[PDB]
Amino acid sequence: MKTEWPELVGKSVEEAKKVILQDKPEAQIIVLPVGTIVTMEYRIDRVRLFVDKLDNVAQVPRVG
């Protein structure tokens, strides 16, 4: 199972969603500002995108 998407740093949310859904059709994609604190529970189906002021992916997306 692919768990990380280093190739998406710098890319838009639209691009990131297209790629993650190709790779991971069940993905629940969540978009948060960089630095947002999340709760600890694990979801194998979730991929969070931490984005910058311009809605570009700012750090490597991972499952969880």
The contacts of residue 55 (CB under 8 Å, 6+ apart) are 12, 13, 31
Technique employed here was X-ray
Q: 4 is in which domain, residue-wise?
A: 1-64
Residue 4 bridge partners (DSSP): 62
Number of C-beta neighbours around residue 56 at 10 A: 16
Resolution in A: 1.0
The contacts of residue 37 (CB under 8 Å, 6+ apart) are none
Count: domains in the chain: 1
Residue 12 bridge partners (DSSP): 56
